[PDB]
């Protein structure tokens, strides 16, 4: 990924809507032996997302690096994924496993900061979280820890969803501090939203 | 798995057996 700063007198750079947040996690040239030598190709693990908390995971195969990055962008574009939150935190401590990828995603009080390793830091920095506390146990990789983090975010659910599963009136599903954090986060959603209307 | 591990182990074992052939006598008498 070099020589991107450019000014063209051509038709268009085609800049348009959906200015999302896009992170390229790792690139390892992938070789293939054929008759008389090696054929080098490229893999780019592409994270895309918006600051609401919708995450994509794309996996680009091409024999050029920006081609593989662009194919990962289109593949994560094809496949988004909804993550439920509280304010800008996570709901409750989970462990995700993608066959060797263990990631523990635990919430924290706000202000602490996204503390995670670089793959999980990528998937969570694209997402709508600002203050959680994760760790990547096992598998020491990028692909399995990204995919394990997304499986960990599939083990998430709303407080309300849990209440619904059990047919119980909330209050009765959460404890009270987390309901107060719901009041804080929806209150600042009201303040920034009504400042957004004017 | 592979048989290479098995064969390294067995090389050690063989060498040792031989070493006890040749020193058999000597170990008996030097020990007695």
């Amino acid at each position: 990924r070099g020589r991107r700063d450019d000014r063209g007198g051509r038709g268009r750079d085609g800049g348009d809507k959906s200015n999302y947040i896009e992170r390229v996690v790792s690139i390892n040239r992938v070789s293939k032996v054929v008759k008389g030598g090696r054929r080098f190709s490229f893999t780019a693990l592409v994270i895309v997302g918006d600051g609401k908390g919708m995450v994509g995971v794309g996996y680009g195969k091409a024999k050029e690096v920006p081609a593989a990055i662009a194919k990962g962008v289109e593949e994560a574009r094809k496949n988004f994924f909804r993550v439920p939150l509280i304010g800008s935190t996570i709901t409750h401590p989970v462990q995700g496993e993608a066959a060797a990828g263990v990631v523990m995603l635990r919430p924290a009080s706000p202000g602490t900061g996204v503390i995670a390793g670089g793959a999980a830091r990528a998937v969570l920095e694209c997402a709508g979280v600002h203050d959680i506390l994760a760790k990547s146990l096992g598998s020491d990789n990028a692909i399995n820890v990204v995919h394990a983090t997304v499986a960990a975010l599939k083990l998430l659910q709303r407080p309300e969803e849990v209440a619904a599963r059990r047919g119980l009136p909330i209050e009765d599903v959460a404890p009270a501090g987390m309901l107060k954090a719901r009041r804080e986060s929806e209150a600042l959603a009201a303040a920034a939203a009504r400042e957004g209307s004017a | 798995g592979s048989v290479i591990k098995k064969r390294r182990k067995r090389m050690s074992k063989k060498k040792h057996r031989k070493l006890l052939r040749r020193t058999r006598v000597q170990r008996r008498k030097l020990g007695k």
Binding site: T91, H92, P93, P107, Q157, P159, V162, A164, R165, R166, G167, L168, V173, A174, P175, M178 | -
Partner: protein
């Protein structure tokens, strides 16, 4: 047969994982109290106690959602024989951030984590379900 309640919750994880409608069990007192707690929190739908070969039996129907999806998203026996886990009042261990619940058998009977918090008594855990 070494742990009764592990076979109970084990049979609920298997019958929950394999999309079953009901389940049948050897009835006992402690399984009746756990079945009554999981009634009162709504993780299972309802249980009925039959008479059968020699003893009574516990037939639990499981509560599913708007399609085939499950309400009990897991069980885990923690106060297991060999490491029976005890809990003072300071912390009735919170489960799944509070969204899950903790079946805690205090001196007043069998309670949940929240009931062990407000009523001011602790003294066990048992399995906690989310």
């Amino acid at each position: 047969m070494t742990d009764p309640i592990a076979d109970f919750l084990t049979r609920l994880r298997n019958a929950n994982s394999a999309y079953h409608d009901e389940v049948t069990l050897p009835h006992s007192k402690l399984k009746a109290n756990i079945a009554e707690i999981l009634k009162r929190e709504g993780y299972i739908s309802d249980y009925r106690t039959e008479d059968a070969r020699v003893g009574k039996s516990l037939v639990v129907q499981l509560k599913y959602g708007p399609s085939r999806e499950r309400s009990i998203a897991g069980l885990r026996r923690v106060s297991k024989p060999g490491l029976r886990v005890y809990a003072k009042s300071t912390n009735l261990p919170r489960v799944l951030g509070g969204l899950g619940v903790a079946i805690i058998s205090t001196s007043s009977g069998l309670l949940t984590d929240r009931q062990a918090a407000r009523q001011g008594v602790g003294g066990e855990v048992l399995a906690y379900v989310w």
